[PDB]
Chain A
């Protein structure tokens, strides 16, 4: 009885509203295999949660530091004063080691549900992990999981899906116009007709490559825009 993505369209058999934010939308039928549907659901949560942090970071960073131009914020010379011109090789080493541990733990949970709940060092500590992708426990200090969990999952995925669309709008707008999200919004308001996608779509403002501390990094736009 739930509303579907389009009017008068039959939902797939395997989509029966069990998961949150289920509109019965699967034109490519990628969820037919039950095991594949679980894995894709996790990746949707990862993209949804990472994207929401991405959108929040870009917007908040723009307000606090208007001039950083997040697209270029990755360059070492643009880092804050304490970290300015830090050796990117050492900086990457921290991320690889720390992310490899965290992500393998999450991965092992998917392979064998409930195996990696307990802390490895300090015996006794555990997380409830009521459902895959929702560890809870220490990950939910405020205890919002208690109550109408199903509704909260719906709110999370719907906002997360919007963030995914929104963030890729930031990327394409930066590539085409060379301005951040808020800056582009101001430009449209000033001259709604003269300054819009109909004009900017034909230009890609990203240089072919950059030199990061002597290492050349290729760069590209998402379409063959006029460099």
Chain B
């Protein structure tokens, strides 16, 4: 009745199309339990929203600041606030924001009131979709917008993982890697730099240094599951 990930298939019973982006994909049945789906619904939005912001940032960094490698931005960046000064602000600010979001997930409608200012309050909303101050402007229908958000978000989540493995294998940024593909599309695919057959296995070398020296300490920098690479 609705488009599915695999056309012609029957969606699992626990999936019925109520949620946005519900295309009936759940081969392992992780969403069968009602409470588990409610939690997994929140994490998908949060993961997607973080990924979209992260993917956009990495692309903008390369265009604006081509010299700096987004992978090495952790050590490359220098600021007066120092390493632990930045971390301290980040921890406390994130702890407040995340706990309040977490509380609404458990008991919705309890953390809508603004603590400091009495008059301001968050209108009634659904879990994971705060309204009011967070949404000053809405281009159009929310139902359509929610589908747009998740579909772009899901793509972004894959996009970021593409950056990491491309960065670890090719040792380059996202746009820089793409330019390499366009130069020699046949000789740059993962098939054209790695292969495993009975009796032999060839894998790309991890182009990220094993360890990083950062202000008198050594930070391990391992390639993700480098032993299982093709």
Cβ < 8 Å to B, chain A residues 70-119: 86-93, 96, 108-109, 111-112, 115-116
CB distance from A127 to the nearest CB of B (A): 14
**Which of these binds chain B: A11-19, A133-141, A191-199, A213-221?**
A213-221
Q: Which of B60-79 contact A (CB under 8 A)?
A: none
Q: Which of B6, B7, B195 contacts A215 (CB 8 A)?
A: B195
Q: Flag B179-206 by CB within 8 Å of A: 1 or 0 each.
A: 0000001111101111101111010000
Cβ–Cβ < 8 Å partners of B186 in chain A: 86-87, 90-91
Whether B192 contacts A112 by the Cβ 8 Å rule is no
Closest to B191 in A: A89
- Chain A CB within 8 A of B9 CB: yes
Which residues of A come within 8 Å of B, CB atoms? 86-93, 96, 108-109, 111-112, 115-116, 120, 214-218
Q: A215-B200, A215-B202, A216-B200 are in contact. Are A89 and B195 (CB under 8 A)?
A: yes
Chain A residues within an 8 Å CB radius of B192: 87-90, 93
Residue in chain A with minimal CB distance to B10 = A112
Contact partners of B185 in chain A: CB under 8 A: 90
Q: Are B191 and A217 in contact (CB under 8 A)?
A: no
Chain B positions within 8 Å of A111 at CB level: 8-9
User: B residues near A, CB below 8 A?
Assistant: 6-9, 185-189, 191-195, 197-200, 202
Which of A88, A108, A217 contacts B8, CB < 8 Å? A108
Would you give 19 A-B contacts (Cβ < 8 Å), ordered by A? A89-B187, A89-B189, A89-B191, A89-B193, A90-B186, A90-B187, A90-B188, A91-B186, A93-B191, A108-B9, A111-B8, A112-B8, A112-B9, A115-B7, A115-B8, A215-B195, A215-B197, A215-B200, A215-B202
Could you tell me if A108 and B7 are in contact, using CB atoms closer than 8 angstroms? Answer: yes
Complex Cα distance, B189 from A96, in Å, reads 12
Shortest Cβ distance from residue B166 to the other chain A in the assembled complex, whole angstroms: 16
CB neighbours of A90 from chain B (8 A): 185-189, 191-192
Look across to chain B and name the residue whose beta carbon is closest to the beta carbon of A96: B191
| B7 touching A92, Cβ below 8 Å | no
A93 and B192 CA atoms in complex are apart in Å by: 8
Measured between beta carbons, the chain A residues less than 8 angstroms from B195 are: 89, 215
Residues in A neighbouring B199, C-beta threshold 8 A: 216, 218
Residues of B within 8 A of A215 (CB): 195, 197, 200, 202
A151–B82 Cα gap in the complex (Å)? 83
B202 CB contacts on chain A under 8 angstroms: 214-215
Complex Cα distance, B119 from A6, in Å, reads: 94
- Determine the chain B residues whose CB is within 8 A of the CB of A93 once the complex forms: 189, 191-192
CA distance A88 to B192 in the complex (A): 7
Given contacts A89-B189, A90-B191, A216-B197, 17 further A-B contacts (CB under 8 A): A87-B186, A89-B187, A89-B191, A89-B192, A89-B195, A90-B187, A90-B188, A90-B189, A92-B191, A93-B189, A109-B8, A115-B8, A215-B195, A215-B202, A216-B200, A218-B197, A218-B198
Q: How far is the CA of A138 from the CA of B193 in the complex (A)?
A: 38
B7, A120: Cβ atoms under 8 Å?
A: yes
